Design a protein around this nucleic acid. Structure first.
Ligand SMILES: [Zn+2]
Length: 252
DNA sequence: GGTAGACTCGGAC
DNA sequence: TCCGAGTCTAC
């Protein structure tokens, strides 16, 4: 799921788990657990804690318990569900948090690609994977000036810059391509080659694109199809190690 | 210390 | 054989 979908999960999952107390934690694929390193320690430490809140940072979900925070990243296909302990599990269920009320929070992932880290709450923001995360794209802390400062300092492409989690939190491939299209900037342009005007416009379109999504596509996945603005066939290439979609006429 | 490469997966191709 | 998010490893 991308940032808007993670926000939807945050909002919808919270009332389904708040105030529930963890009775057991069952782990069927230990490699998902990244901290503590031993999955048995991860399970043991969560027992007896009550869920107090659920926050989002970029695409990370931060489950707030009594003492600990559980930091979860779903990557491309990870999913959470709340359901009865009496019912059979769905396929690809890797971690289950069992509550005292006979309900469960279940983590599934066909790709087995997601991650979980647990730390004392006061520690979580200074440890991986949250340490060094850049500002929320919809926050005043992500500004044209912040973006300009990062862009001038790098040799990388503008696409590479926007995909960098230290620059801006959880701005995914789809939204990078869409924002660059809407701003009229080629993804392969060196970040340092962007004018002040281009940086301002890019910031504006990033906020608009992801803001709209949290509340249709021009380029992403539309290679070979006509651009919706000018009719030129959308092209796809590799930029910053990712499939990258753009209109060669609208973007410069 | 900035930046690329390795690493994790399994469904689609 | 391709893909990819974000951390870890190595130049
Ligand atoms: Zn166009």
């Amino acid at each position: 799921p991308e940032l808007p979908e993670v926000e939807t999960i945050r909002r919808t999952l919270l009332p389904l788990i708040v105030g529930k107390t963890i009775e057991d934690v069952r782990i069927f694929w230990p490699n998902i657990i990244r901290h503590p390193r031993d999955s048995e320690a991860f399970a043991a430490r969560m027992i007896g804690q009550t869920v107090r809140g659920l926050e989002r940072r970029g695409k990370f979900l931060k489950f707030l318990l009594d003492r600990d925070a559980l930091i979860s990243h779903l990557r491309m296909e990870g999913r959470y569900a709340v359901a009865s302990a009496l019912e059979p599990l769905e396929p690809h269920t890797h971690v289950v948090f069992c509550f005292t009320d006979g309900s469960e929070l279940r983590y599934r992932d066909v790709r087995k690609f997601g991650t979980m880290h647990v730390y004392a709450k006061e520690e979580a923001d200074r440890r991986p994977p949250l340490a060094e995360l850049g500002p929320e794209p919809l926050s005043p802390a992500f500004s044209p000036a912040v973006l300009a400062e990062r862009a001038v300092k790098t040799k990388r492409s503008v696409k590479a810059l926007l995909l960098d989690c230290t620059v801006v939190a959880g701005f995914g491939n789809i939204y990078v391509d869409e924002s660059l299209f809407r701003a009229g900037i080629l993804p392969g342009r060196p970040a340092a080659s962007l004018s002040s005007k281009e940086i301002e416009r890019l910031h504006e379109e990033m906020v608009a694109t992801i803001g709209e999504a949290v509340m249709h596509l021009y380029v992403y996945g539309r290679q070979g199809n006509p651009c919706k603005r000018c009719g030129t066939p959308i092209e796809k290439t590799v930029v910053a190690g990712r499939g990258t979609h753009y209109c060669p006429r609208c973007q410069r």
